[PDB]
Amino acid sequence: KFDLPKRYQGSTKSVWVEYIQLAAQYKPLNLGQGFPDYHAPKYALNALAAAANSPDPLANQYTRGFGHPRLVQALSKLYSQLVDRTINPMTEVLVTVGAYEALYATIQGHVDEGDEVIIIEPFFDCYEPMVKAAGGIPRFIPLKPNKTGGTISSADWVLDNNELEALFNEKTKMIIINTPHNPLGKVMDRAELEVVANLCKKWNVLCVSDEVYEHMVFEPFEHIRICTLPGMWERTITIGSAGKTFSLTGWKIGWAYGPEALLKNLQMVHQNCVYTCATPIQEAIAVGFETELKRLKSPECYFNSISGELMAKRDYMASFLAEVGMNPTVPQGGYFMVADWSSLDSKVDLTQETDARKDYRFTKWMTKSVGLQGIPPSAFYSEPNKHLGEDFVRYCFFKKDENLQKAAEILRKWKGSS
């Protein structure tokens, strides 16, 4: 009967290990998770096969700990252009096992016992347990909509700037931002970025920018990197993911980039966690970046076409969710959509003596009864703020159109025509 006082409390199973099992069990239409239902860019897949089949015996053995040279070079080339600076491929970038381990290396490497970390709700669920495991003290601020009538935009979900500055103090070590945002799809504009950038500069805090969905912003919006703001490069760490950039979530390769001084900490954590990442996968991703770097402005460039591909799907889902009676939040980016479901909202019917956040029971009930899987957004809120996400649900619309129609059908049937 021992105890692991390393701040490894609760979190018995993450929402994913939980819901990934329900999907393996009731095998419904999987609108939960977060990945495409169809094949990723062929050039990327071909490149992995090419690495497996390479005549070079080094292609499937250990590569550099901090990242495959070909990949790191490619990464530098891309982000140097986007950041308007020459990022050193050897010291200002680190390759990791997805954006997950990038987040882990960052939080473990820059938050010590007592350090306060500000997290914006709803948040990608791993932020809080990561900070906790590091001995940090999370402080939460929720995003909230601007009066919801029916269909709104993720731009309508805003935090209270006065509440934000109040959380900043001499103990504040880090703030984590996620743009484009999961699960709302919100794209922070310049003013919103400046608000957190000013606070970071006044209080000397580290900004961690989770930008895995960087290429998935819908017109007329635009992704802005906070590390490009006036004095932010010196105090920002930016994270990306190959699984999101190339729609190959199964490859689990991500990266962090920023000043050599901040990145050193990440390197020490990484080195003593997994040491190195898969070589053939890193090579294939390097080839993929090299492929896109040649056509960065072309409409065939995957960094430019994914949003046009997704936009139609986004609009489709917003329409059938609204038609069924939900109040969807149309995302400015990404492939997630949060919607306010209705059935006990203002039509107090069924009860729940169980008392355990509605969005969890609704979402579960659905995949087990009607065979449509969504995920409960309360899973992305601190314990005392969970209630904020109980009337919602998150759905992924990165699916083949036949499957999107399928969802619309099961929802229309679940309801009634007339």
Residue ranges in 53-72 that form contacts with a second copy under rule CB under 8 A: 53, 57-66, 69
Q: Are 262 and 110 in contact (CB under 8 A)?
A: yes
The Cα-based distances of 253 to 71, 83, 130, 240, 242 in angstroms read: 11, 21, 19, 9, 5
The answer to whether 231 contacts a second copy (rule: CB under 8 A) is: no
Q: Are 176 and 210 in contact (CB under 8 A)?
A: yes
Q: How far apart are alpha carbons 148 and 65 in whole angstroms?
A: 49
**Binding residues for a second copy, total number by CB under 8 A:** 86
Q: Is 99 annotated as a binding residue?
A: yes
The answer to whether 36 contacts a second copy (rule: CB under 8 A) is: yes
Tell me which of 284, 306, 366, 404 binds a second copy, using CB under 8 A.
284
Tell me which of 70, 110, 139, 358 binds a second copy, using CB under 8 A.
110
Contacts of a second copy in 317-346 (CB under 8 A): none
Q: Closer to a second copy at the Cβ: 130 or 321?
A: 130
Q: How far apart are alpha carbons 60 and 311 in whole angstroms?
A: 38
Site string for Br ion, 27-66 (x = CB under 5 A): ---------------xx-----------------------
C-alpha 71, offset from chain centre: 22
Q: Is 369 annotated as a binding residue?
A: no
Tell me which of 28, 98, 288, 331 binds a second copy, using CB under 8 A.
98
Tell me which of 112, 222, 323, 409 binds Br ion, using CB under 5 A.
222
The answer to whether 25 contacts a second copy (rule: CB under 8 A) is: no
Q: Closer to a second copy at the Cβ: 238 or 267?
A: 267
Tell me which of 131, 217, 237, 379 binds Br ion, using CB under 5 A.
217
Contacts of a second copy in 182-201 (CB under 8 A): none
Q: Kindly report the number of other CB atoms within 10 A of residue 304's CB atom.
A: 15
The answer to whether 100 contacts a second copy (rule: CB under 8 A) is: yes
**Buried b vs exposed e over 221-252: b needs ≥16 C-beta within 10 Å?**
bebbbbbbbeebbebbbbbbbbbbbbbbbebb
Q: Are 66 and 95 in contact (CB under 8 A)?
A: yes
Q: Where are the alpha helices (DSSP H) in 274-324?
A: 279-293, 302-324
Tell me which of 63, 282, 307, 378 binds Br ion, using CB under 5 A.
307
**Binding residues for Br ion, total number by CB under 5 A:** 13
H/E element, 138: strand 137-142
